[PDB]
Amino acid sequence: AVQKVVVHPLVLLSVVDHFNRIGKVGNQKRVVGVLLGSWQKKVLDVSNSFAVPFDEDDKDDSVWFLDHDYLENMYGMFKKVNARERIVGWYHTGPKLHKNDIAINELMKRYCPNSVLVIIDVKPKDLGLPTEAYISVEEVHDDGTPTSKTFEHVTSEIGAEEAEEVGVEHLLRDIKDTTVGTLSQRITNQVHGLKGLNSKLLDIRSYLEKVATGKLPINHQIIYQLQDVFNLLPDVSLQEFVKAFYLKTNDQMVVVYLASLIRSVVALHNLINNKIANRDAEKKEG
Amino acid sequence: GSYVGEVVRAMDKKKVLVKVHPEGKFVVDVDKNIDINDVTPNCRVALRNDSYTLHKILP
Amino acid sequence: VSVEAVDPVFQAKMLDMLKQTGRPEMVVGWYHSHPGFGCWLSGVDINTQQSFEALSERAVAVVVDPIQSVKGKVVIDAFRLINANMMVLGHEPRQTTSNLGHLNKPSIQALIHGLNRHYYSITINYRKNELEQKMLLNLHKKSWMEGLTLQDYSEHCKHNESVVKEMLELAKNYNKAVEEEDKMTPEQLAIKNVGKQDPKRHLEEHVDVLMTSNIVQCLAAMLDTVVFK
Amino acid sequence: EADALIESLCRDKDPILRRSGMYTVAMAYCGSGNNKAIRRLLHVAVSDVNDDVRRAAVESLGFILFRTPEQCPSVVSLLSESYNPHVRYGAAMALGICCAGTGNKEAINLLEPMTNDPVNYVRQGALIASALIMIQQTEITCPKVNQFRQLYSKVINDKHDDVMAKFGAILAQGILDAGGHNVTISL
Amino acid sequence: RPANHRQLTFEEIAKSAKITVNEVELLVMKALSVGLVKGSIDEVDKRVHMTWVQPRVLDLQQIKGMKDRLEFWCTDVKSMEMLVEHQAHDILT
Amino acid sequence: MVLESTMVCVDNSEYMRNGDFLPTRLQAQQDAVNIVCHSKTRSNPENNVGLITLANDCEVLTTLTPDTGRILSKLHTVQPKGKITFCTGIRVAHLALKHRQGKNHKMRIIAFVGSPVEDNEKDLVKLAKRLKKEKVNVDIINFGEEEVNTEKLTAFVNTLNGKDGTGSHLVTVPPGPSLADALISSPILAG
């Protein structure tokens, strides 16, 4: 139904506010904020949000505390100031999906429409994207297991509208822009193998742990498509792709003649001015 | 940007009446680094659009 | 904007709903927008300011105006009310006059000193902690990076073979299209050599053309890594 | 001793304490016993985005390099007209302290661009740096009339100059007047 | 066979199926007619080249070979990342 | 006056429409909620009342507020499903007391029990120790019976009840065509 979402950095900055207004208690749970956004277009667009006092129990996961009156009052006053945005979904800032989150989700599946869930991180030490849109849908399973609410990842992008760019860019003065050429290309080309390395190494090690030490339907079926597509690249023999390397290598030779020739043209004013300025300022110096 | 002043008459109180684009005719002292007597009347000048200080004489 | 616009039971109602959440903070000021006609404050503004400063002695007033503010700079200023009985003495007895060199950045030649009497301003600095810094930083770098990040690499590596070859030929067309101009230049340099009349430089553009041309070289090794493993 | 302390506190998130590593690393390292700290003082001077450590930078460089008057202004020469006004102003502090009590004209001949700029910072600390060198100096040795008269023209130019610039102007004028020429300073 | 001459021939198929070579074209046409396989063989002299099919059941030898080529791919990508990055960070950063 | 919060836990099983007792005594205890909430309103109108059931998936029907006018509405659409859940019925109110606005409002939770308790005595002593720990005034109101009313519920109360001077009271109602209303108005908890 929905292919992608758009989450503005304002709400994650309000998750910085989630970690601001704590007051140092010793709890630091997955504090839930009431996500607001635009379900109106087929794409989901988050503008802003707020948060609600939410408590679980230490031992019991299934005890969870929300408010309808706080939702209708904060959403009521927010709709009074801006009715162009409505309720859409929610989020917890914990790294882990609890068992209770189907029931916590179910309250906003009832009163709000089909609500989206966002897992983000309490400490932004993850190099990966912190935000993951998990659609709250029940899907029919091939094994015959009974149908339950299933959180499939909807792909996400983090974009800012107009002024959030200006304010963020004014606050940083540290980030550099697009800046094609040597640096912004070559830095992605520096850390890029580390970026698939920590992804893959972060996945296949504990994945391999859940191979031998795991049960309880880990989606054993998607391992077959998984390993299948992984064996759709069986270390290509390159024999047809040799001429492709002649092609990129011949384009490389074009970059050779352009670099050599054009830099050699830049040598002109250099190797004129080096003589004609120095010897004339010298010969009229005395 | 800034406007285009045209002085038609210089006033002796160092408050030069300058003919401006319609709804203009804004009498003002121009900037202190430029003298008044150099600004010849019936000639076009360079004037700021709010502060009404002269930049230079124009042909 | 008015003192009548301030609904006090709605104000204190939302305030108390913030109090039952994690916000036990008093109001520190009231702000608004003044689009188009400049950031200064009208008589309604100065009078409801005069009423709302009876409780808080500081009573900060801020005007955001992105309407004529460009997307390059987000210049905003917080404004102040002087006391009318301070007109006999010197105006602002503010110590530590270092930052006022930064406070002469509002130097528009009508509004600031055109309206600065009875009506002054205050400096603005920020704060950013490391969670905002690295969360917003990796948030913004990730806002310029990809998901698994290896995704759009081979795309442009192979648009070097599909699309950028056209931009390489057009690049050679702007190059050669300048070379027909630099064909005529050594006669000029073979005549005058004194003074420079052309604002066109012909060099740094072609350096940039080479920098865009080196994407082929930088992504060829990327193709070598993908072909490797 | 404090090398791991100050290098540890140099990676601080706090810009104030990042300045304080430099202010601290001055008095441990005075006497130019360290060609090490100049690397990271200049490296934080150019590299950092916040100008607090950047105008706070080169004063420790003067505090270590006070032994030689000659070697300082040649390597603050680019910093005389820097990118921002703040490295210009801290450079005016550095030429203020490295050349204080001396007669080196290599700071003095650089003041004539320093005395005229749209920024009141470099105009103020231009007069502050000008105040620290001309003390205990006779005219018959060295041609100082230019900086005498530009030092004198500000208290008549106080009508059309900045309010903080004139503060460092007449405040700089007391430095020649200090003690009725009898007392001075020495590093 | 995961790699190392993925290409095969009709003699193992017909030896698996005790069928003649007249019917193996009908057999691979039926196999493509189901749609579990996408493999199209560009041979003139008779060959059986294959593409995608779904494993769908289990294989512990492909669990272990999965760990083998998977870990191998991981240490190769790590090896090239360290390899480029060691001199690369020191000259570019 | 009396500054305290009131929490009620209501039965939604089908055991509340049984034709032996009152004709859907769900309505009768709903009117008991009406007379105790209006009586607390007459004593101290700023007392806040929250509303929740004892089902498997308990739902805060109304957040704690002194406005009982819409609580009158939320007492309807009762959804008569499920049987009982005891433990998270306790935990869903006693820890939800910490979200309250007035922190000077003392802790009082009652419960309307119309089903036999599914929890063993081992959980009864963990929860009775749990509530005697955090020191909440807990009045246990037990409607209907299949077995005897209080056998382990007695020692559940006595181990739940500390503070012998003016502590909590236990409500045990016998069978009777008389109402639940004036019969639970007989202790000091209504007053």
mmCIF file of C-alpha atoms in Angstrom, chain D:
data_model
loop_
_atom_site.group_PDB
_atom_site.id
_atom_site.type_symbol
_atom_site.label_atom_id
_atom_site.label_comp_id
_atom_site.label_asym_id
_atom_site.label_seq_id
_atom_site.Cartn_x
_atom_site.Cartn_y
_atom_site.Cartn_z
ATOM 1 C CA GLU D 1 54.023 15.931 32.903
ATOM 2 C CA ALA D 2 50.685 17.335 31.684
ATOM 3 C CA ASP D 3 51.059 16.221 28.051
ATOM 4 C CA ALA D 4 48.434 13.478 28.320
ATOM 5 C CA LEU D 5 46.286 15.863 30.360
ATOM 6 C CA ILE D 6 46.242 18.608 27.747
ATOM 7 C CA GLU D 7 46.128 16.276 24.753
ATOM 8 C CA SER D 8 43.274 14.496 26.543
ATOM 9 C CA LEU D 9 41.458 17.796 27.131
ATOM 10 C CA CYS D 10 42.180 18.934 23.568
ATOM 11 C CA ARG D 11 39.660 16.398 22.265
ATOM 12 C CA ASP D 12 37.030 17.960 24.549
ATOM 13 C CA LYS D 13 33.577 18.684 23.193
ATOM 14 C CA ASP D 14 33.677 21.956 25.138
ATOM 15 C CA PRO D 15 35.124 24.894 23.149
ATOM 16 C CA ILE D 16 35.881 26.880 26.318
ATOM 17 C CA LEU D 17 37.922 24.043 27.772
ATOM 18 C CA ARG D 18 39.453 23.526 24.325
ATOM 19 C CA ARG D 19 40.731 27.094 24.651
ATOM 20 C CA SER D 20 41.804 26.276 28.183
ATOM 21 C CA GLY D 21 44.053 23.494 26.951
ATOM 22 C CA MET D 22 45.931 26.122 24.977
ATOM 23 C CA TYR D 23 45.924 28.709 27.776
ATOM 24 C CA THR D 24 47.101 25.933 30.075
ATOM 25 C CA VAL D 25 49.717 24.527 27.696
ATOM 26 C CA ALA D 26 51.371 27.943 27.460
ATOM 27 C CA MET D 27 52.768 28.124 31.006
ATOM 28 C CA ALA D 28 53.886 24.509 31.043
ATOM 29 C CA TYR D 29 55.766 25.040 27.792
ATOM 30 C CA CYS D 30 57.142 28.606 28.023
ATOM 31 C CA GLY D 31 60.679 29.243 26.830
ATOM 32 C CA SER D 32 60.243 27.485 23.433
ATOM 33 C CA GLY D 33 61.155 24.102 24.846
ATOM 34 C CA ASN D 34 58.513 22.498 22.629
ATOM 35 C CA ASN D 35 58.299 22.390 18.871
ATOM 36 C CA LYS D 36 55.366 20.033 19.477
ATOM 37 C CA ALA D 37 52.610 22.311 20.785
ATOM 38 C CA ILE D 38 53.030 24.822 17.954
ATOM 39 C CA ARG D 39 51.783 22.084 15.586
ATOM 40 C CA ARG D 40 48.457 21.627 17.345
ATOM 41 C CA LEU D 41 48.083 25.289 18.335
ATOM 42 C CA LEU D 42 48.295 26.248 14.686
ATOM 43 C CA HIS D 43 46.328 23.138 13.733
ATOM 44 C CA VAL D 44 43.455 24.107 15.994
ATOM 45 C CA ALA D 45 43.930 27.676 14.766
ATOM 46 C CA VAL D 46 43.285 26.732 11.143
ATOM 47 C CA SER D 47 41.260 23.548 11.518
ATOM 48 C CA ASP D 48 38.618 24.366 14.133
ATOM 49 C CA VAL D 49 35.316 25.942 13.160
ATOM 50 C CA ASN D 50 34.845 27.932 16.391
ATOM 51 C CA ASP D 51 36.814 31.166 16.536
ATOM 52 C CA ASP D 52 37.168 31.086 20.337
ATOM 53 C CA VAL D 53 40.090 28.693 20.211
ATOM 54 C CA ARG D 54 41.246 30.448 17.046
ATOM 55 C CA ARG D 55 41.627 33.867 18.598
ATOM 56 C CA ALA D 56 42.725 31.999 21.738
ATOM 57 C CA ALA D 57 45.389 30.132 19.765
ATOM 58 C CA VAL D 58 48.584 32.026 19.053
ATOM 59 C CA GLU D 59 49.021 33.745 22.411
ATOM 60 C CA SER D 60 50.473 30.524 23.812
ATOM 61 C CA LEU D 61 52.694 30.537 20.715
ATOM 62 C CA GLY D 62 53.999 33.929 21.782
ATOM 63 C CA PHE D 63 54.305 32.638 25.343
ATOM 64 C CA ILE D 64 56.597 29.844 24.251
ATOM 65 C CA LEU D 65 58.399 31.873 21.559
ATOM 66 C CA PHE D 66 59.121 35.026 23.598
ATOM 67 C CA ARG D 67 62.855 34.216 23.467
ATOM 68 C CA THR D 68 63.290 35.215 19.826
ATOM 69 C CA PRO D 69 61.745 38.490 18.608
ATOM 70 C CA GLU D 70 62.738 37.767 15.025
ATOM 71 C CA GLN D 71 61.134 34.407 14.341
ATOM 72 C CA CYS D 72 57.619 35.340 15.486
ATOM 73 C CA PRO D 73 56.164 37.965 13.060
ATOM 74 C CA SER D 74 57.460 36.148 9.986
ATOM 75 C CA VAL D 75 55.257 33.216 10.918
ATOM 76 C CA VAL D 76 52.334 35.309 12.124
ATOM 77 C CA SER D 77 52.714 37.293 8.871
ATOM 78 C CA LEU D 78 49.936 35.413 7.081
ATOM 79 C CA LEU D 79 47.813 35.626 10.225
ATOM 80 C CA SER D 80 48.037 39.440 10.193
ATOM 81 C CA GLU D 81 45.329 39.427 7.528
ATOM 82 C CA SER D 82 43.635 36.097 8.190
ATOM 83 C CA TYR D 83 40.332 34.696 6.978
ATOM 84 C CA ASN D 84 38.082 35.699 9.908
ATOM 85 C CA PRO D 85 38.581 38.827 12.063
ATOM 86 C CA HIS D 86 39.308 36.712 15.118
ATOM 87 C CA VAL D 87 42.598 35.231 13.954
ATOM 88 C CA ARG D 88 43.455 38.788 12.916
ATOM 89 C CA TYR D 89 42.722 39.913 16.474
ATOM 90 C CA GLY D 90 44.537 37.039 18.154
ATOM 91 C CA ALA D 91 47.409 37.700 15.773
ATOM 92 C CA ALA D 92 47.344 41.264 17.088
ATOM 93 C CA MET D 93 47.605 39.789 20.581
ATOM 94 C CA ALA D 94 50.521 37.620 19.427
ATOM 95 C CA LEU D 95 52.453 40.504 17.884
ATOM 96 C CA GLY D 96 51.508 42.373 21.046
ATOM 97 C CA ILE D 97 53.166 39.859 23.347
ATOM 98 C CA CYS D 98 56.081 38.567 21.257
ATOM 99 C CA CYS D 99 57.406 42.019 20.459
ATOM 100 C CA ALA D 100 56.647 43.632 23.831
ATOM 101 C CA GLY D 101 59.557 45.413 25.487
ATOM 102 C CA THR D 102 61.583 45.151 22.278
ATOM 103 C CA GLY D 103 62.502 47.283 19.296
ATOM 104 C CA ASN D 104 61.684 44.845 16.482
ATOM 105 C CA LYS D 105 60.213 46.746 13.552
ATOM 106 C CA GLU D 106 58.853 43.583 11.936
ATOM 107 C CA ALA D 107 55.710 43.849 14.018
ATOM 108 C CA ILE D 108 55.677 47.619 13.588
ATOM 109 C CA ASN D 109 55.690 47.694 9.786
ATOM 110 C CA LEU D 110 52.740 45.275 9.785
ATOM 111 C CA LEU D 111 50.604 47.613 11.912
ATOM 112 C CA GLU D 112 49.914 49.968 8.997
ATOM 113 C CA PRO D 113 47.554 47.409 7.416
ATOM 114 C CA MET D 114 46.307 46.507 10.905
ATOM 115 C CA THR D 115 45.279 50.075 11.745
ATOM 116 C CA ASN D 116 42.734 50.324 8.902
ATOM 117 C CA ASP D 117 40.053 47.665 8.397
ATOM 118 C CA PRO D 118 36.230 47.558 8.496
ATOM 119 C CA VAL D 119 36.371 45.401 11.651
ATOM 120 C CA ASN D 120 36.685 47.200 14.989
ATOM 121 C CA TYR D 121 38.429 44.178 16.533
ATOM 122 C CA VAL D 122 41.593 44.450 14.437
ATOM 123 C CA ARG D 123 41.398 48.245 14.751
ATOM 124 C CA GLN D 124 41.258 47.965 18.540
ATOM 125 C CA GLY D 125 43.926 45.298 19.038
ATOM 126 C CA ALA D 126 45.946 47.043 16.355
ATOM 127 C CA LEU D 127 46.201 49.926 18.808
ATOM 128 C CA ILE D 128 46.707 47.526 21.715
ATOM 129 C CA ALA D 129 49.541 45.791 19.855
ATOM 130 C CA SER D 130 50.868 49.186 18.807
ATOM 131 C CA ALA D 131 50.852 50.269 22.455
ATOM 132 C CA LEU D 132 53.051 47.393 23.642
ATOM 133 C CA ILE D 133 56.062 48.025 21.387
ATOM 134 C CA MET D 134 56.497 51.819 21.159
ATOM 135 C CA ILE D 135 56.971 52.028 24.938
ATOM 136 C CA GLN D 136 60.540 52.998 25.922
ATOM 137 C CA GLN D 137 61.548 54.057 22.423
ATOM 138 C CA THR D 138 63.166 57.222 21.113
ATOM 139 C CA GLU D 139 62.292 58.743 17.766
ATOM 140 C CA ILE D 140 65.895 59.409 16.710
ATOM 141 C CA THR D 141 66.560 55.656 16.667
ATOM 142 C CA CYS D 142 63.385 54.576 14.904
ATOM 143 C CA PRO D 143 60.677 56.300 12.802
ATOM 144 C CA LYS D 144 57.633 56.119 15.051
ATOM 145 C CA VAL D 145 55.822 59.402 14.168
ATOM 146 C CA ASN D 146 53.330 57.543 11.958
ATOM 147 C CA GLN D 147 52.087 55.375 14.798
ATOM 148 C CA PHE D 148 52.260 58.346 17.177
ATOM 149 C CA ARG D 149 49.902 60.369 14.981
ATOM 150 C CA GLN D 150 47.581 57.493 14.151
ATOM 151 C CA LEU D 151 47.504 56.808 17.879
ATOM 152 C CA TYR D 152 46.659 60.493 18.427
ATOM 153 C CA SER D 153 44.067 60.770 15.648
ATOM 154 C CA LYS D 154 41.629 58.383 17.299
ATOM 155 C CA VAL D 155 40.750 60.568 20.285
ATOM 156 C CA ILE D 156 39.805 63.284 17.821
ATOM 157 C CA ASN D 157 38.374 60.613 15.475
ATOM 158 C CA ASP D 158 36.308 59.243 18.382
ATOM 159 C CA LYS D 159 33.228 60.946 16.939
ATOM 160 C CA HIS D 160 33.249 58.887 13.751
ATOM 161 C CA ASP D 161 34.822 55.652 15.052
ATOM 162 C CA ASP D 162 33.389 52.714 16.985
ATOM 163 C CA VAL D 163 32.654 52.884 20.687
ATOM 164 C CA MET D 164 34.714 49.810 21.520
ATOM 165 C CA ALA D 165 37.498 50.894 19.152
ATOM 166 C CA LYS D 166 38.002 54.188 20.991
ATOM 167 C CA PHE D 167 38.090 52.249 24.273
ATOM 168 C CA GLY D 168 41.175 50.359 23.162
ATOM 169 C CA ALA D 169 42.402 53.571 21.547
ATOM 170 C CA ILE D 170 42.660 55.766 24.642
ATOM 171 C CA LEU D 171 43.250 52.675 26.785
ATOM 172 C CA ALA D 172 46.161 52.012 24.444
ATOM 173 C CA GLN D 173 47.181 55.663 24.852
ATOM 174 C CA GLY D 174 47.688 55.168 28.563
ATOM 175 C CA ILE D 175 50.328 52.506 27.884
ATOM 176 C CA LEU D 176 52.879 54.990 26.585
ATOM 177 C CA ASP D 177 51.841 57.273 29.451
ATOM 178 C CA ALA D 178 52.365 54.469 31.989
ATOM 179 C CA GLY D 179 54.337 55.610 35.017
ATOM 180 C CA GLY D 180 55.481 58.830 33.346
ATOM 181 C CA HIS D 181 57.774 56.830 31.006
ATOM 182 C CA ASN D 182 59.809 55.588 33.976
ATOM 183 C CA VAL D 183 58.394 52.095 34.465
ATOM 184 C CA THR D 184 58.083 49.508 31.677
ATOM 185 C CA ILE D 185 57.517 45.776 31.230
ATOM 186 C CA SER D 186 59.846 42.870 30.525
ATOM 187 C CA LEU D 187 59.046 39.283 29.653
#
